[PDB]
């Protein structure tokens, strides 16, 4: 807290959807103590062995003969660190990995797979610290979530349909910050996915609701978009002090 | 930040500038010097630009488009095709080749835009380099009319012939390593 | 819109991206205040 540098305290762009922008202490700890967003989840950790076995089965020749070769072998498959080889086809590998994430065979919902098309690296991180959030999945310009899923969830009790079934269906997906860097998001399905003057026609995901970017204390603020930003921080601090 | 941009020059203000003044720091964050012009140069923009050029530090790196080192066995050989003409001209009445000539050639090529912005002259640059380094560095300069501004630098003629050194016949820093050292020194320290 | 301009008024209500950018600006102001206190206090003590 003693350090007066105003760099580590500032609200970074990558905090979007994973740490509350409003809720921070004021004083020596401005921007150094943070609070999770409402829908944020933190990876618990998993064994990388099944992912490595799948990669070995698909291709990912390791101990190759200087095959990167100006990255002619597109992408180098990384895991939690540990360059484990490279593949010639990166896009088929990425699509197969996403399908496996849906079927939940080798990739738990928390396994994070990032391909950097330029610089040609795929990272595949499962390291127990990553903070991720649920995002709906957009195929073409249509949300995968449909009326069947919403009707079953509406009957949630005595229908034995839950959020985990929504994840298993492939409707929603957990995305961490590194994957948020490689994903085209829509705030709302209707306003953004639908055809208009085309800003983007390659949305890959959709926010479940924008208001989930706030935390617990900032979620009680009514009409928070109509207040000045420091006032929402003040209200978070004061709502931690209300009597009830 | 939020300082009004009257001019394109940043200035420390507020608490940090008060700290600098109060501490009498030897190194200001933004040391600046306001210069007022005495004569008609204040009124006329071209003379003011001349003063600005005279007051602004300019290294050879700032006006150099690209530098190369070619091993040229003979001056007449002209390994680079382009210099074949002007080298010939300079070797129609060769000067300082009596001792010897260096087998290595530093063929610096200057950007015309930077040269004309700083209003530098090929003779000016050549004089600075040759005089400051001495007779060791011999420079051949192109005409400004030529499309490429080329300065051909060679190591000491007497040092190449080794009659002047006498002592022991042992290469010091070879020649190409010495030429690279010279190139770095010119790039960062010419102060044209 | 991409780089932070908020065209909506407070009464109209900020859109979500504008909301996050506004939060970034307010955070910078708060950090400035908090950092300012200590440096100014040290200067004042030295002068006195």
């Amino acid at each position: 807290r003693d350090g007066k540098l105003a760099k580590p305290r500032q609200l970074h762009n990558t905090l979007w959807g994973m740490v509350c922008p409003a809720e921070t202490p004021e004083g020596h700890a401005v921007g150094l103590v943070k609070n999770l967003a409402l829908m944020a989840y933190i990876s618990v950790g998993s064994q990388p062995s099944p992912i490595l076995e799948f990669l070995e089965e698909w291709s990912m020749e390791n101990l190759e003969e200087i095959s990167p070769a100006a990255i002619a072998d597109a992408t180098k498959i990384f895991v939690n660190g540990c360059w484990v080889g490279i593949h010639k086809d990166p896009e088929q590998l990425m699509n197969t990995l996403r399908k496996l994430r849906r079927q939940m065979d080798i990739i738990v919902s928390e396994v994070s797979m990032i391909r950097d098309i330029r610089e040609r690296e795929i990272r595949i991180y499962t390291d127990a610290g990553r903070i991720c959030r649920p995002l709906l999945i957009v195929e073409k310009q249509k949300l995968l979530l449909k009326k069947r899923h919403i009707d079953q969830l509406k009957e949630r009790e005595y229908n034995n349909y839950s959020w985990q079934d929504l994840v298993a269906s492939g409707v929603v997906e957990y995305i961490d910050t590194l994957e948020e860097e490689t994903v085209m998001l829509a705030m709302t399905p209707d306003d953004l996915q639908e055809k208009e003057v085309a800003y983007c026609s390659t949305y890959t995901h959709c926010e479940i609701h924008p208001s989930m970017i706030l935390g617990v204390c900032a979620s009680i603020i009514p009409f928070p978009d109509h207040n000045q930003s420091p006032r929402n921080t003040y209200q978070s601090a004061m709502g931690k002090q209300a009597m009830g | 930040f939020h300082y009004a941009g009257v001019s394109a020059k940043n200035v420390t203000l507020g608490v940090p500038r008060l700290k600098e003044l109060i501490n009498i720091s030897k190194k200001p964050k933004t040391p600046s010097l306001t210069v007022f012009l005495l004569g008609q140069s204040a009124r006329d923009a071209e003379r003011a630009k001349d003063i600005l050029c005279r007051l602004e530090h300019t290294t050879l790196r700032k006006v150099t488009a690209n530098t190369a080192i070619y091993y040229d066995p003979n001056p007449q050989s002209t390994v680079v095709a382009e210099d074949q003409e002007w080298v010939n001209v300079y070797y129609e009445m060769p000067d300082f080749d009596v001792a010897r000539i260096s087998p290595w050639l530093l063929r610096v090529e200057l950007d015309r835009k930077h040269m004309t912005d700083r209003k530098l002259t090929m003779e000016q640059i050549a004089e600075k380099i040759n005089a400051g380094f001495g007779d060791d560095l011999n420079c051949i300069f192109n005409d400004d009319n030529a499309e490429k501004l080329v300065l051909r630098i060679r190591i000491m003629n007497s040092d190449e012939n080794k009659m002047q050194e006498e002592e022991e016949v042992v290469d010091k820093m070879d020649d190409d390593v010495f030429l690279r050292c010279i190139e770095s020194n010119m790039l960062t320290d010419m102060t044209l | 819109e991409s780089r932070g301009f908020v065209e909506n008024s407070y009464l109209a209500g900020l859109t979500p991206t504008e909301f996050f950018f506004h939060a970034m600006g307010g955070r910078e102001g708060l950090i400035d205040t908090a950092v300012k206190t200590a440096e100014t206090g040290y200067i004042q003590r030295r002068l006195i």
Binding site: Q228 | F1, H2 | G26, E28
Partner: peptide
């Protein structure tokens, strides 16, 4: 939060 010349 206003502009570049104002406040954040």
């Amino acid at each position: 939060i206003w502009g570049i010349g104002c406040n954040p």
